[PDB]
């Protein structure tokens, strides 16, 4: 006889601060380096895949997930929180914008559902916030290319470049200098790889590096070369071999 | 309509005609009867227009949700089972006669589904109003050592038999080749073989016989 | 029923002999008078040693057997391997509880090594009845005399295949909702043998 | 009484070049007795026009549902809905109301204001999606109306010429009915000016 | 709130006490385990200690057969091990009916993970401390070894070990793998894989095992079986005559 | 024990205040400033965008300015995250009056539904209250322009000029002097900006540390046009009033 | 410390039992004293009823639960009502469903489960009232002791209430005598009065105080209250 | 203190919470039960303490049936023990209806097992203070299992719980080893009586009544019966020849 509990696990403090949220801000800091660059001409997201036994593999791990075909997401914070959140987020996006619509969700609108979920878990006791902050990078035809940031509270903000994970401020500061105005998507990949090189040390391989762009949708990414019937992915992960070429080219 | 599915030793062809009728009068020369579920699981549907399309989108959604969840290809047998459990709950209220086809890493497959709730596995299957005339062609000319060119060519012949002898069928024929080895080909309007119901010509209207009681203008606006 | 006319071969049996049980059926679905399927599976696996022969209406039977497959996958996993009689109970529950909307005539046929083969017949209404052999479908009535004299406790494997091969080929000959290949499933300690005989073969023998 | 033919109504839509046109009667009846010469069966939310014919109680309840859906969506996305998006929104709402006992024939009309296409699309009692762009008809006299449109209509027309077509096509189909008198309106739509022309026609 | 010693929430150090202590005791059954993959097969070798002679060994298992093809090794305390086994076996059975297809190692893994992370938030319900090693010989990707930990974390392996002598086993495995530069043993026939595994175990825990001290389960194409005592004895015998 | 995890912080104090409520009032003073000026010709809304990077974009000026309806908009002082939950429920509240009676919602009602909900959470459910204040800008033809504010205690009041956020007191003191019974929108635009410059917790003032909207009568319809000025359109206006610096 | 293990009912302590169970047990004794005795053909309960005042009067605490079944309480009146209501529903169902008069053994086990269940919550509580449940069915007369802990023992004589032991030792003496007085309503009543007096040491034995209840071989559940116990004193 | 003396809602560094530790104790303050597995059966035996002369024999027995072939005996707290068998009975009855079979002994063990595990992952649901030894004969053979407060179970050849658990197991492993398993069901009753005797020395302050039962394939024919009459008296007598403590 149980399920009578609903007293909150997130309370106000005497500085009007929120206890769990302070705790969770650390969790993000103890993560690994992930970045985003919007080139206007696309979006590039990259992270370090790292793993917790030498016998494990990080080639068979993933830290970018497809949320819907044309949108991919990445995080800094704790692995468990990220997996349950991605699943719930994938569920609402299908149900409410492809059974009520048929066009894949505009990006910002998808951000608002992820944000609502995370805040909902903060209001209500017997659940606690998710301990993670996302950069959800997408494309939509009526927005163009987009980049959003979701904070662990549930708060959002747009950015045209940002960085998260260890040495967050300093990584972001580096982007400001190396990239101004509008430059290419290609060129921004070259930059993103360098920026990710300076954060990390002791791994430099393309089997521990994952870089993906949202920047093209080919029949090759459509799974059929016939006449289109849906938009299909605009998400594309660049190969371990592909990553390796570009490190040499810095 | 006439919907068919034909197995070859390298892939599967489904095909359909795209004519929607209200009486003998042709409402639509084009509406897809071939619906995409995932890039390589295509489904043909016959019967009542509204029902086949809606069910196919619900399943279509649940399968894509599945594919992302497992980080693996979707199986044809998942789509099959979702379809069966949906018909069963609603006890026949869904009136979808479906031909579900797919290619996976497990091989090429061909099944059909009645609204009545029974599924079958076949080497070739057909459904529709053109079902009798087409299934006749397909059983006779199907052979061992079937190939791509032979499977398209047979598939054209099928739809055509149903056009000719069911005169509620007609209009363009859309074909979809799904190969295990190479990226599937949706062939919109692969044949353009029949036309619109009868016209006699029409001509300009004199303005001493068309009169206006009053008129205004107005404008579209959005805040 | 569920919706419309779905019909199957309507002649199934399971027969016991020296090594186990052989179950046989003919395979053919028709939807009205249109031949929905030449060759199908009416010999349905619900466990590796426990199969069934399905009769009644094709749709109804398929929903019900799906559910069976689900309960015994779970029974096996938690509570260990099930009896023919146990498989038979799940069938019965469904048939009885849904007699007012579905019609399912099931012969549940199983091989065990510690009680030999067992044959359990499930009525349309849902009941559990033990026999040394059963015939069901509605063409079972014309071979009732045949089956009852030429069934014997203890026979060879070749010979049981003749008895079942002879029985059903007569049923398919008088019956009009039957045809296509003959399937059999031999559940023995020699494994699971699946037998197929094609139209030309059973007619002749 | 009748399922949808208590008050009657018929609706016609046509395609042209950077214009479409959508036209309706103004009848409301109570059985075969025509009661009113005004009843507007076409509504619009911005540059998407929705005509729904059939029983008036059912056209009204739907019209308020789509107004709601569109308003709240407009508010979130900070822009209007598109013809193409609205057709999706309609299919699903209607498939939700197939199980309910509605008796409607919607037809969707608009011009895309950043893709630059005329757009018309159709819907039925069952609520199935009809992709065609030539003419789509719906209502009581839909049978007479297809016969007429299919001969009278000719592809790709300037607004003036689209007017002559739609007007006469409706007027002559309507004259073989008593459930489609009591006045009529025609709307000629471009995405930056709309002309409303009232016609003068028969009643009982 | 104001509590973290009676309920479970985020730490400000960031290392959650309940998750850490769950990492720690699991070893209260006196187990050490590994699983490796062969080219065609996946073998588990696992310790057994019998603490009484009022106990039969043959009801003592740490491998539970989920389906027909899927195996699971639980390293934990046995009331918690079994609790997970009951839940896993039904979810597997439910999936198989619904989707027409036998459950993936990774999907089982992921689903139990997401649930444990849910119980970690819950303030009225505790998380199981179980470490679950899901193995099979899938034909849609070959041999697979996927390990979960109670946190909600799971990741793919080349071979794995669990127990306090995790490091020692790790080294034995790292050495072999560096040398061949392969992430599997390519030995045709399962047999030669089981024996090799057994050698490396004898090195790590540094003791010779008996039939009643190992329990060996092997996963094969489309079928999973645990190996018997008499067979286990054949393995120990045959390596005594290589030197 | 279930109640042996409870702390009951949702109850009245020995001072008769509600702990969690008082803490929410604090929150609002650490978030940006929001100012509402109602004139009888328009309503001018500003809300202050704090922490502005150059890699934060300036193509968005809807992220604390939200249209709740096509005649009602708010400026948020608080979190994006608290607000969003209530914002969706407001928008819905709009559609209900609209569908039933076929006309625009009154402001005074719509405000009450939000406040009652805030009030609800601290009475019952064991919940936290939302840490958010809204300044409501809306129009009716029964009252002209109306301007309200609601705050974390579930108390709401009407104002004809109001400030919320950091340095509320100081802004208000300046507001009280420069206010005059006579109004125009363009006069109100100058007024807002003069004040905004003097309340910033950073030297001078720049256009990007502002978010802006005006409510004028018509500009593409008969009346009641809400225009949300984007960052660059704000930049132009800071020169126009003559606060070029 | 103390407040840990009183303030929760879904706890246990190092002794092998929670403190709340020790207090509930104490509470039975805080009841007024009542004895129960049987020879296994008839069963009698003899009970000393106290009333608060000279200006109060006696209210019932021997409860007909059926015309063949009853109970006496000792302990908490509020709780006793809750339990009595339960036993009464239970008696009724037993008659309707099985044609049974209900054995004590079956009733006790069912009362146990409910009690257990309310220690499986916060804001449920043990009853803290004990009952001597008697009835005459087909295995004869029966006397049970129910405790709100869930301990069910059938005893041939017993007592609950303050100074249980006084009657209990008298009962262990007179045992062999009473069990061979079989078939007598009047000999057993006389015994009950004699018994209850070995409990007493700070209370008076008076007509109006005392109350007798019987069920037995040829007696359906009949109570002697007030006046009608004078002739057994 | 550590906070886990009154919570089941969190993880403890002993691998298990203190309140589960407290329930184990309660098992040790009950009165001795054993279980003897045989080559054709199983034997159950229990000590019931006699304190008072008022008790009646074999109606206050702590041996309870489930079905008609499954024997359950426990040591520790009485209310927890009755609750436990009462749940087992419902779930067994559910099994019997659903699969039309008698329950397996390994199946019954799980059915209890999940219910006992469930109230250790929940703070609001009280652990069992009983250890229950159970088994019977079934269609897989005969089986003896014993279930702990933990949710721990394993298959036994002999099993014990209660005050004299140590002493009893010591005598039992010796006899079970010296024989193949404690020979046949008849032999085992005399041995069982001797264990109940030896065990009484750990309790020799109060008297006992020896109460024995069986379910044996070859000497009760698939049913559970209590062992009584001539045979029970005979067994006490046999014990009093050899042991004379």
From Swiss-Prot, chain A:
Keywords: Cytoplasm, Isopeptide bond, Nucleus, Proteasome, Ubl conjugation. GO terms for cellular component: nucleus; proteasome complex; proteasome core complex, alpha-subunit complex; proteasome storage granule. PROSITE patterns: PROTEASOME_ALPHA_1, PROTEASOME_ALPHA_2. There is a cross-link at residue 108 (Glycyl lysine isopeptide (Lys-Gly) (interchain with G-Cter in ubiquitin)). Gene3D superfamilies: Glutamine Phosphoribosylpyrophosphate, subunit 1, domain 1. InterPro entries: Ntn_hydrolases_N, Proteasome_alpha, Proteasome_alpha-type, Proteasome_asu_N, Proteasome_sua/b. The 26S proteasome consists of a 20S proteasome core and two 19S regulatory subunits. The 20S proteasome core is composed of 28 subunits that are arranged in four stacked rings, resulting in a barrel-shaped structure. The two end rings are each formed by seven alpha subunits, and the two central rings are each formed by seven beta subunits. The catalytic chamber with the active sites is on the inside of the barrel. This is Proteasome subunit alpha type-2. It comes from Saccharomyces cerevisiae (strain ATCC 204508 / S288c). The lineage of its organism: Eukaryota, Fungi, Dikarya, Ascomycota, Saccharomycotina.
Curated annotation (Swiss-Prot), chain B:
The proteasome degrades poly-ubiquitinated proteins in the cytoplasm and in the nucleus. It is essential for the regulated turnover of proteins and for the removal of misfolded proteins. The proteasome is a multicatalytic proteinase complex that is characterized by its ability to cleave peptides with Arg, Phe, Tyr, Leu, and Glu adjacent to the leaving group at neutral or slightly basic pH. It has an ATP-dependent proteolytic activity. GO terms for molecular function: endopeptidase activity; threonine-type endopeptidase activity. The keyword tRNA-binding does not apply. GO terms for biological process: proteasomal ubiquitin-independent protein catabolic process; proteasome-mediated ubiquitin-dependent protein catabolic process. Keywords: Cytoplasm, Hydrolase, Nucleus, Protease, Proteasome, Threonine protease, Zymogen. InterPro entries: Ntn_hydrolases_N, Pept_T1A_subB, Proteasome_bsu_C, Proteasome_bsu_CS, Proteasome_sua/b, Proteasome_suB-type. The keyword Aminoacyl-tRNA synthetase does not apply. Signal peptide: none annotated. One of its GO terms (cellular component) is proteasome storage granule. It comes from the Eukaryota. It is found in: Cytoplasm; Nucleus. Its EC number is 3.4.25.1. Belongs to the peptidase T1B family. It is an enzyme of class 3 (hydrolase). CDD domains: proteasome_beta_type_7. It holds the Pfam family Pr_beta_C. This is Proteasome subunit beta type-2.
Curated annotation (Swiss-Prot), chain C:
It catalyses: Cleavage of peptide bonds with very broad specificity. Keywords: Acetylation, Cytoplasm, Hydrolase, Nucleus, Protease, Proteasome, Threonine protease, Zymogen. The active site is at residue 10. Gene3D superfamilies: Glutamine Phosphoribosylpyrophosphate, subunit 1, domain 1. CDD domains: proteasome_beta_type_6. Its EC number is 3.4.25.1. It is an enzyme of class 3 (hydrolase). The keyword Acetylation applies. Its main location: cytoplasm. GO terms for cellular component: cytosol; nucleus; proteasome complex; proteasome core complex, beta-subunit complex; proteasome storage granule. Pfam families: Proteasome. It is found in: Cytoplasm; Nucleus. One of its GO terms (biological process) is proteasomal ubiquitin-independent protein catabolic process. Belongs to the peptidase T1B family. This is Proteasome subunit beta type-1.
Curated annotation (Swiss-Prot), chain E:
Belongs to the peptidase T1A family. The lineage of its organism: Eukaryota, Fungi, Dikarya, Ascomycota, Saccharomycotina. One of its GO terms (biological process) is proteasomal ubiquitin-independent protein catabolic process. InterPro entries: Ntn_hydrolases_N, Proteasome_alpha, Proteasome_alpha-type, Proteasome_asu_N, Proteasome_sua/b, Proteasome_subunit_alpha6. The keyword DNA-binding does not apply. PANTHER family: PROTEASOME SUBUNIT ALPHA/BETA (PTHR11599). SMART domains: Proteasome_A_N. It comes from the Eukaryota. This is Proteasome subunit alpha type-1. The modification Phosphoserine is found at residue 228. The 26S proteasome consists of a 20S proteasome core and two 19S regulatory subunits. The 20S proteasome core is composed of 28 subunits that are arranged in four stacked rings, resulting in a barrel-shaped structure. The two end rings are each formed by seven alpha subunits, and the two central rings are each formed by seven beta subunits. The catalytic chamber with the active sites is on the inside of the barrel. Interacts with CIC1. PROSITE patterns: PROTEASOME_ALPHA_1 (PS00388), PROTEASOME_ALPHA_2 (PS51475). There is a cross-link at residue 223 (Glycyl lysine isopeptide (Lys-Gly) (interchain with G-Cter in ubiquitin)). It is found in: Cytoplasm; Nucleus. GO terms for cellular component: mitochondrion; nucleus; proteasome complex; proteasome core complex, alpha-subunit complex. Keywords: Acetylation, Cytoplasm, Isopeptide bond, Nucleus, Phosphoprotein, Proteasome, Ubl conjugation. SUPFAM superfamilies: N-terminal nucleophile aminohydrolases (Ntn hydrolases). The gene is SCL1. It comes from Saccharomyces cerevisiae (strain ATCC 204508 / S288c). The keyword Membrane does not apply. Present with 15200 molecules/cell in log phase SD medium. Coiled coil: none annotated.
């Amino acid at each position: 006889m149980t399920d009578r509990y609903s007293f909150s696990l997130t309370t106000f403090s005497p500085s009007g601060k929120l206890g769990q949220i302070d705790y969770a801000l650390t969790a993000v800091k103890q993560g690994v380096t992930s970045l985003g660059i919007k080139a206007t001409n696309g979006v590039v997201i990259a992270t370090e895949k790292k793993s917790s036994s030498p016998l494990a593999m990080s080639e068979t791990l993933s830290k970018v997930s497809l949320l819907t075909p044309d949108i991919g997401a990445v995080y800094s914070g704790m692995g468990p929180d990220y997996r349950v959140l991605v699943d719930k987020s994938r569920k609402v996006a299908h149900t409410s914008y492809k059974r009520i619509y048929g066009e894949y969700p505009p990006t910002k609108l998808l951000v608002s559902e992820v944000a609502k979920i995370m805040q909902e878990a903060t209001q209500s006791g017997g659940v606690r916030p998710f301990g993670v902050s996302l950069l959800i990078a997408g494309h939509d035809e009526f927005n163009g290319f987009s980049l959003y940031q979701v904070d662990p509270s549930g708060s959002y903000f747009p950015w045209k470049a940002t960085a998260i994970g260890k040495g967050s401020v300093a990584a972001k500061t580096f982007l400001e200098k190396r990239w101004n105005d509008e430059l290419e998507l290609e060129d921004a990949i070259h930059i993103a790889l360098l920026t990710l090189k300076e954060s990390v040390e002791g791994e430099f391989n393309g089997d521990t590096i994952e870089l993906a762009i949202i920047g093209d949708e080919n029949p090759d990414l459509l799974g059929y070369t016939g006449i289109p019937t849906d938009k299909g992915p605009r998400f594309r992960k660049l190969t371990s071999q592909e990553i390796n070429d570009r490190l040499e080219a810095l | 309509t006439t919907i068919v599915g034909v197995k070859f030793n390298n892939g599967v062809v489904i095909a359909a005609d795209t004519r929607s009728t209200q009486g003998p009068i042709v409402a639509d020369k084009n509406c897809a009867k071939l619906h995409r579920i995932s890039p390589k699981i295509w489904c043909a549907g016959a019967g009542t227009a509204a029902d086949t399309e809606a069910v196919t989108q619900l399943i279509g959604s649940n399968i894509e949700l599945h594919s992302l969840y497992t980080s693996r290809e979707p199986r044809v047998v998942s789509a099959l089972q979702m379809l069966k459990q949906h018909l069963f709950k609603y006890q026949g209220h869904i009136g979808a006669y479906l031909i579900v086809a797919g290619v996976d890493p497990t091989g090429s497959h061909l099944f059909s589904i009645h609204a009545h709730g029974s599924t079958d596995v076949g080497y070739y299957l057909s459904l529709g109003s053109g079902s009798l005339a087409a299934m006749a062609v397909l059983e006779s000319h199907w052979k061992q050592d079937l190939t791509k060119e032979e499977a398209i060519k047979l598939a054209s012949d099928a739809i055509q038999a149903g056009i000719w002898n069911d005169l509620g069928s007609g209009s363009n024929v859309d074909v979809c080749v799904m190969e295990i080895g190479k990226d599937a080909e949706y062939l919109r309007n692969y044949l353009t073989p029949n036309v619109r119901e009868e016209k006699q010509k029409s001509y300009k209207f004199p303005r001493g016989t068309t009169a206006v009681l009053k008129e205004s203008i107005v404008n579209i606006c959005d805040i | 029923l569920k919706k419309g006319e779905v019909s199957l071969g309507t002649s199934i049996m399971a027969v016991t002999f020296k090594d186990g049980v052989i179950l046989g059926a003919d395979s053919r679905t028709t939807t009205g008078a249109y031949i929905a399927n030449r060759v199908t599976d009416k010999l349905t696996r619900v466990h590796d040693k426990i199969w069934c022969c399905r009769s009644g209406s094709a749709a109804d039977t398929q929903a019900i057997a799906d559910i069976v497959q689900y309960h015994l996958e779970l029974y096996t996993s938690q509570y260990g391997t099930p009896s023919t009689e146990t498989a038979a109970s799940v069938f019965k529950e469904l048939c009885y509880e849904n007699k007012d909307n579905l019609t399912a005539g099931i012969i549940v046929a199983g091989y065990d090594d510690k009680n030999k083969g067992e044959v359990y017949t499930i009525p349309l209404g849902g009941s559990v009845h033990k026999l040394p052999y059963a015939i069901a479908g509605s063409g079972s009535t014309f071979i009732y005399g045949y089956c009852d004299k030429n069934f014997r406790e203890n026979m060879s494997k070749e010979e049981t295949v003749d008895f079942i091969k002879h029985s059903l080929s007569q049923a398919i000959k008088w019956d009009g909702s039957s045809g296509g290949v003959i399937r059999m499933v031999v559940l023995t300690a020699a494994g699971v043998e699946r037998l197929i005989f094609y139209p030309d073969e059973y007619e002749q023998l | 009484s009748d399922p949808s033919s208590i008050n009657g109504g018929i609706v016609v839509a046509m395609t042209g070049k950077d214009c479409v046109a959508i036209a309706c009667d103004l009848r409301l009846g109570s059985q075969s007795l025509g009661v009113s010469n005004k009843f507007e069966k076409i509504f619009h939310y911005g540059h998407v026009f929705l005509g729904i014919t059939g029983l008036a109680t059912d056209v009204t309840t739907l019209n308020e549902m789509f107004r709601y859906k569109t308003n709240l969506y407009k508010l979130k996305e900070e822009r209007a809905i598109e013809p193409e998006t609205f057709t999706q929104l309609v299919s699903s709402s209607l498939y939700e109301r197939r199980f309910g006992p509605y008796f409607v024939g919607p037809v969707v009309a608009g011009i895309n204001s950043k893709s630059g296409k005329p757009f018309i699309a159709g819907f039925d009692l069952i609520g199935c999606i009809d992709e065609a762009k030539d003419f789509i008809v719906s209502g009581t006299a839909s049978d007479q109306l297809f016969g007429m449109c299919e001969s009278l209509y000719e592809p790709n027309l300037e607004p003036e010429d689209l007017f002559e077509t739609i007007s006469q096509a409706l007027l002559n189909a309507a004259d073989r009915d008593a459930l489609s008198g009591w006045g009529a309106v025609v709307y000629i739509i471009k995405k930056d000016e709309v002309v409303k022309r009232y016609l003068k026609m028969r009643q009982d | 709130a104001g509590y973290d010693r009676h309920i479970t929430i985020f730490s400000p150090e960031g290392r959650l006490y309940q998750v850490e202590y769950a990492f720690k005791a699991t070893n209260q059954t006196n187990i050490n385990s590994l699983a490796v993959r062969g080219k065609d097969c996946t073998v588990v070798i696992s310790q057994k200690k019998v603490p009484d002679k009022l106990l039969d060994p043959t009801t003592v298992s740490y491998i539970f057969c989920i389906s027909r093809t899927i195996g699971m090794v639980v390293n934990g305390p046995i009331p918690d091990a079994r609790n997970a086994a009951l839940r896993a076996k039904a979810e597997a059975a439910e999936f198989r009916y619904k989707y027409g297809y036998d459950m993936p190692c990774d999907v089982l893994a992921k689903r139990m993970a997401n649930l444990s992370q849910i119980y970690t938030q819950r303030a009225y319900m505790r998380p199981l401390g179980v470490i679950l090693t899901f193995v099979s010989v899938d034909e849609e990707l070959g041999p697979s070894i996927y390990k979960t930990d109670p946190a909600g974390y799971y990741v793919g392996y080349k071979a794995t070990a669990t127990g306090p002598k995790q490091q020692e086993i790790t080294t034995n495995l790292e050495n072999h793998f560096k040398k061949s530069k392969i992430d599997h043993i390519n030995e045709e026939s399962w047999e030669k894989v089981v024996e090799f595994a057994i050698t490396h175990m004898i090195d790590a825990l540094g003791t010779e095992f008996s039939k009643n001290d190992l329990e060996v389960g092997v996963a094969t194409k489309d079928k999973f079986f645990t190996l018997s005592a008499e067979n286990i004895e054949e393995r120990l015998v045959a390596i005594a005559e290589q030197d | 024990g279930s109640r042996r995890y409870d702390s009951r912080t949702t109850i009245f104090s020995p001072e008769g205040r509600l702990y969690q409520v008082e803490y929410a009032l604090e929150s609002i003073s650490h978030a940006g400033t929001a100012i509402g000026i109602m004139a009888s010709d328009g309503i001018v809304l500003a809300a202050e965008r704090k922490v502005t990077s150059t890699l934060l974009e300036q193509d968005t000026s809807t992220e604390k300015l939200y249209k709740l309806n096509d005649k009602i908009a708010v400026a948020v002082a608080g979190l994006t995250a608290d607000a969003e939950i209530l914002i969706n429920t407001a928008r819905i509240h709009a559609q209900n009056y609209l569908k039933t009676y076929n006309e625009d919602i009154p402001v005074e009602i719509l405000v009450r539904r939000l406040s009652d909900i805030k009030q609800g959470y601290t009475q019952h459910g064991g919940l936290r209250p939302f840490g958010v204040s809204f300044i409501y800008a809306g129009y009716d033809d029964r009252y002209g322009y109306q301007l309200y504010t609601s705050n974390p205690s579930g108390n709401y009041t009407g104002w004809k000029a109001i400030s919320v956020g950091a340095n509320t007191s100081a802004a208000q003191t300046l507001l009280q002097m420069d206010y005059k019974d006579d109004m125009k929108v363009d006069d109100a635009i100058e007024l807002a900006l003069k004040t905004l410059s003097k309340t910033t917790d950073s030297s001078a003032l720049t256009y990007d540390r502002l978010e802006f909207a005006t409510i004028r009568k018509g500009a593409n319809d008969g009346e009641v046009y809400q225009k949300i000025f984007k960052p660059q359109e704000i930049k132009d206006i800071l020169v126009k009033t003559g606060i070029t610096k | 410390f103390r407040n840990n293990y009183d303030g929760d009912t879904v706890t246990f302590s190092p002794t092998g039992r929670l403190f709340q169970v020790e207090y509930a047990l104490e509470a039975i004794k805080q009841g007024s004293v009542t004895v129960g005795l049987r020879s296994n053909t008839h069963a009698v309960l003899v009970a000393l009823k106290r009333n608060a005042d000279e200006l109060s009067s006696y209210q019932k605490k021997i409860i007909k639960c059926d015309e063949h079944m009853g109970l006496s309480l000792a302990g908490l009146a509020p709780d006793a009502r809750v339990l009595s209501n339960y036993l009464r529903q239970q008696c009724n169902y037993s008659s309707l469903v099985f044609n049974r008069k209900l054995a004590v053994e079956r009733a006790g086990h069912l009362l146990c489960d409910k009690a257990q269940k309310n220690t499986q919550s916060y804001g449920g509580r043990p009853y803290g009232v004990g009952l001597l449940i008697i009835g005459y069915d087909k295995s004869g007369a029966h006397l049970l002791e129910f405790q709100p802990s869930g301990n069910v023992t059938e005893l041939y004589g017993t007592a609950i209430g303050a100074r249980s032991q006084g009657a209990k030792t008298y009962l262990e003496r007179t045992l062999d005598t009473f069990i061979k007085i079989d078939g007598n309503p009047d000999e057993l009543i006389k015994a009950g009065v004699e018994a209850i007096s070995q409990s007493l040491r700070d209370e008076s034995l008076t007509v109006d105080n005392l109350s007798i209840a019987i069920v037995g071989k040829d007696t359906p559940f009949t109570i002697y209250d007030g006046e009608a116990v004078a002739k057994y004193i | 203190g550590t906070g886990y003396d009154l919570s089941n809602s969190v993880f403890s560094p002993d691998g298990r919470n203190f309140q589960v530790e407290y329930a184990v104790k309660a098992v040790e303050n009950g009165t001795t039960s054993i279980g003897i597995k045989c080559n054709d059966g199983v034997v159950f035996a229990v000590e019931k303490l006699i304190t008072s002369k008022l008790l009646v024999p074999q109606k206050n027995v702590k041996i309870q049936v489930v079905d008609r072939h499954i024997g359950c005996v426990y040591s520790g707290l009485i209310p927890d023990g009755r609750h436990l068998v009462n749940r087992g009975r419902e779930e067994a009855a559910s099994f019997k209806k659903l699969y039309k079979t008698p329950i397996p002994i390994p199946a019954f063990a799980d059915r209890l097992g999940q219910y006992v595990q469930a109230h250790t992952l929940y703070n609001s649901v009280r652990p069992f203070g009983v250890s229950t030894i159970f088994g019977g004969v079934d269609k897989n053979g005969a089986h003896l299992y014993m279930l702990e407060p933990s949710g721990s179970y394993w298959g036994y050849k002999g099993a014990a719980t209660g005050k004299g658990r140590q002493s009893a197991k010591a005598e039992l492993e010796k006899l079970v080893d010296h024989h193949p398993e404690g020979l046949s069901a008849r032999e085992a009753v005399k041995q069982a009586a001797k264990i109940i005797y030896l065990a009484h020395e750990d309790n020799k302050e109060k008297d006992f009544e020896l109460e024995i039962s069986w379910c044996s394939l070859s000497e009760t024919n698939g049913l559970h019966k209590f062992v009584k009459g001539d045979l029970l008296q005979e067994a006490i007598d046999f014990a009093q020849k050899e042991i004379n403590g």
